């Protein structure tokens, strides 16, 4: 208890102080002091200048809050304990545990205890992306959903052009961190019952405060994370090492995930938020996807990986401007919704992603859009952070685990390709469905002669499958115009329109066995390069090589019965003679 005490000890004290809330009304004593203390506290730690390098100075500032609180000390029944409890754990943390404190900042359980807190810190610290992630995910899907509007977009814009140039994420973070306090000041300053009729904050619990201070606590923690990483960093190859068993290859792939497969994930999420978003700004970015995807050498992606990534995000910026305009201080509307009778009108406004007053965009598929730039983000690291034909004949054959896992992937994996292929072509009625089932039936036709043909023209005609189904998605997402903007008007006018093509709409979802389809036709395109398919085609060479053998033992087994059935039957009429 003693060792606890000494160790966890401001976390105690950080809690009593902000369980100082929802005091009533707002009171300058009750929030403003306290709520400006623990701001600057916190701001202090983040920026290291005294609550991590002159901690002399928080226990001084912490004894000033107190001395602050004591001089300021049913009405009273209960407001009158609240400040004595927390002066009194303030002593406490200030009589005992403030120099060991300082100190330290400065049974088979046992063993299963420290290696899962020696992963979970070495992951942390190591793979601080997945950290600056979970930041960014509380960041976003918070800003942009639940208050859009101004004194949110600084942040939003400031982490959304940080995440793609790192050089700029530290003193960025301190950034936010400054700017979520101001936040918090603001949000305690409108509070107040003083106002009477940007971002209003309109309090209703006076809960209408905890996005900020959850965005805190985040940046507190991540920040928290690093400081222990240093503190342990200053106290106290992996290919060649796959091929053992499948433990080996599990923990290289915990290690490298990203490194081989960042383009098809990032794929894979341009996909899902084409699908979930289905609108025009969804098609500027299928008709992007279609433009990198076009460059099929993996150089080209790099020279091109820029401009995409600054393209998007800036894509993500004007997103994000335009869900919030005009605001509803000035009476006037926008320039298109009037009373005339132009065309546009509800439908065609919720399709278009246009400001509108009468139906908002919505603002909870901005994160895909996120997690889009995440990914590109991500993938631009990778790029910028640039024996086997032996063990390949020996996972020809089986061996303990890793070669039944490696035979089912790169042999046994080509023909689940086109069943997939086949159940999307026929799980939905569409002109798109037929093709997909003949091209699934004229790979299954020739596809053994397809798999022994030279790497050339298998790649050639893969990448033609993958470009009609990126075409097929990109032509489902234009037609969701007509499939929602004119569902009525279209359907009175022409119902075989309505039967060529899926034409409900959609508003994870959506084009679901579609997506499947392109991430497994994608895996397999990776699979045609790598070496171990080289000697599974060899194999099948070598059985293209024989099949003049397997007759002659049918007749030679052939030969043997009869030969054997007319033995017996002479035997048998040698006897009758
Ligand atoms: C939400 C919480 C989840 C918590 C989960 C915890 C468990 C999962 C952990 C995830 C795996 C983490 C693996 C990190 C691997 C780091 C690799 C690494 O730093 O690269 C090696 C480093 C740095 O090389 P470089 O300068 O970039 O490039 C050198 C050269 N140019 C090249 O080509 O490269 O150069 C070096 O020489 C340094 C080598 C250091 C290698 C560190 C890893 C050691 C082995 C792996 C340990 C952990 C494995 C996973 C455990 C999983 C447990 C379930
Ligand atoms: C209720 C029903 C549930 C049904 C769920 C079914 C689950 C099925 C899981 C199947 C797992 C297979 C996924 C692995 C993905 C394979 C695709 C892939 O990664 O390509 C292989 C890549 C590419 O080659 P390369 O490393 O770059 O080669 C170096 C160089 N480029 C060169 O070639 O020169 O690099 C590699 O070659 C790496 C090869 C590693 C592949 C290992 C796969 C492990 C499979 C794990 C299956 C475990 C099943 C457990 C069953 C439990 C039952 C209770």
């Given at each position: 208890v003693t060792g606890i005490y000494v160790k966890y000890w401001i976390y105690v004290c950080a809690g009593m102080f902000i369980v100082?809330?929802?005091?009533?009304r707002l009171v300058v004593y009750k929030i403003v002091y306290m709520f400006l203390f623990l701001l600057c506290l916190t701001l202090f730690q983040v920026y290291?200048?005294?609550?991590?390098?002159l901690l002399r100075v928080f226990w001084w500032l912490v004894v000033a809050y107190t001395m602050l609180v004591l001089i300021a000390?049913?009405?009273?029944?209960?407001?009158?304990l609240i400040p004595g409890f927390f002066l009194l754990a303030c002593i406490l943390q200030l009589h005992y545990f403030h120099r060991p404190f300082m100190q330290l900042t400065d049974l088979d359980l046992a063993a299963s205890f420290s290696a899962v807190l020696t992963r979970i810190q070495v992951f942390v610290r190591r793979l601080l992306e997945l950290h600056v992630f979970k930041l960014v995910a509380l960041y976003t899907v918070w800003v942009a959903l639940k208050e859009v509007s101004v004194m949110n977009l600084l942040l939003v814009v400031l982490w959304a052009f940080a995440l793609p140039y790192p050089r700029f994420r530290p003193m960025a973070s301190c950034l936010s961190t400054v700017w979520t306090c101001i936040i918090i000041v603001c949000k305690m300053l409108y509070?107040?019952?003083?106002?009477?009729?940007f971002g209003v904050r309109?309090?209703?619990?006076?809960?209408?405060i905890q996005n900020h201070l959850q965005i805190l606590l985040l940046l507190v923690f991540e920040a928290v994370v690093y400081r222990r990483q240093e503190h342990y960093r200053r106290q106290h190859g992996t290919r060649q090492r796959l091929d053992q068993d499948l433990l080996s290859c599990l923990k290289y792939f915990i290690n490298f995930?990203?490194?081989?497969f960042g383009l098809e994930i990032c794929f894979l999420m341009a996909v899902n938020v084409i699908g979930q978003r289905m609108n025009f700004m969804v098609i500027l970015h299928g008709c992007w996807l279609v433009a990198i995807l076009t460059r099929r050498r993996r150089e080209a992606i790099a020279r091109l990986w820029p401009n995409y990534c600054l393209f998007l995000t800036l894509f993500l910026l004007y997103q994000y401007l335009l869900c919030l305009?005009?605001?509803?201080?000035?009476?006037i509307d926008y320039?298109?919704?009037?009373?005339?009778?132009?065309?546009?009108?509800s439908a065609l406004i919720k399709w278009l992603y246009l400001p509108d007053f009468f139906r908002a965009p919505?603002?909870?598929?901005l994160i895909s859009d996120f997690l889009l730039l995440l990914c590109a983000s991500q993938q631009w690291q990778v790029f910028s952070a640039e024996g086997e034909p032996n063990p390949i004949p020996n996972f020809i054959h089986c061996r303990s685990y890793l070669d039944m896992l490696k035979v089912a992937v790169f042999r046994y994996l080509f023909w689940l390709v086109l069943v997939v292929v086949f159940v999307a072509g026929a799980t939905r009625i569409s002109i798109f469905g037929l093709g997909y089932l003949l091209a699934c039936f004229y790979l299954l036709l020739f596809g053994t002669t397809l798999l022994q043909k030279d790497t050339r023209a298998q790649l050639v005609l893969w990448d033609c499958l993958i470009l009609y189904n990126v075409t097929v998605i990109i032509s489902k997402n234009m037609l969701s115009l007509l499939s929602c903007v004119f569902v009525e008007q279209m359907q009175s006018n022409f119902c075989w329109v309505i039967q060529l093509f899926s034409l409900v709409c959609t508003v994870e979802a959506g084009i679901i066995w579609d997506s499947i389809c392109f991430f497994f036709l994608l895996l397999q395109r990776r699979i045609?390069?790598?070496?171990?398919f080289l000697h599974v085609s060899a194999d099948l060479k070598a059985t293209a090589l024989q099949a003049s053998r397997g007759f002659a033992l049918y007749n030679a087994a052939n030969l043997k019965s009869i030969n054997f059935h007319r033995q017996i039957e002479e035997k048998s009429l040698a006897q009758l003679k």
């Open positions: 100082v809330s929802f005091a009533g290291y200048t005294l609550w991590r390098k000390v049913s009405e009273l029944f209960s407001s009158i509070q107040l019952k003083i106002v009477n009729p309109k309090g209703y619990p006076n809960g209408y995930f990203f490194y081989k305009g005009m605001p509803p201080a000035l009476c320039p298109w919704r009037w009373s005339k009778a132009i065309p546009m009108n919505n603002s909870t598929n045609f390069l790598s070496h171990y």
